[PDB]
Design a protein around this ligand. Sequence first.
Ligand code: HEM
Length: 148
Amino acid sequence: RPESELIRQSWRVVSRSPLEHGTVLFARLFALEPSLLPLFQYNGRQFSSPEDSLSSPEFLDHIRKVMLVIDAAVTNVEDLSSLEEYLTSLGRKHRAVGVRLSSWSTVGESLLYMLEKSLGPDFTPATRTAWSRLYGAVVQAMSRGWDG
Ligand code: HEM
C-alpha cells in the first residue's frame, strides 16, 4: 500500500528522536486541552502548569511509552487489527485515569501537529490523510475501551 509506506517513511523522521517529538505532542496537547494536565498524578500530585509536566521524569517516561505505542501502530499499519485488543485495553486504562472519549481526537490533532512540524514541506497532503487514518484507527481502538 502507498499510504502504508508514506506513514512508514514519515514516521522514521520522528522515530529518531522520540522524546523530542513526543515532547511536542504533549505541549500541543495541553495547549489545546488543558484539562488533561491533572490526570497525571505522579507521587499524588497534579502538575500546576504544563511546564511542570516536562520536568517530571515519569511524564517523560509516559511520552516514550506513547511513542512506542505509535511505533507499534506504524510497524503494523497494513494489519492493525493485530493491535486492536492491546489498544482497547490501553483505552480502558486511560478511561480510568480520566481521559474523555473526546480528548482522543485532540491527541490525534496533536499527533498530526507534531508530524507536520517535524516534516515541514514533507508533510504532503497525502501524508496528512494517511496519518489521520492511522491514528484514527488507533482511536477507533483506544475509544473502544470506553464500552459501553
Ligand atoms: C490523552 C492524554 C493522555 C493522558 C492524560 C495519559 C495519561 C496516562 C497516565 C496517567 C498513565 C498512567 C501513568 C503512567 O504510566 O505514566 C498512562 C499510561 C500509559 N499511556 Fe497514557 N495518557 C494519554 C495518552 C496516551 C496516548 C496517546 C498513548 C499512546 C498512544 C498513551 C500510552 C500509554 C501507555 C502505553 C501507558 C502505560 C499503560 C499500561 O499500564 O499498560 N497514553 N497514560
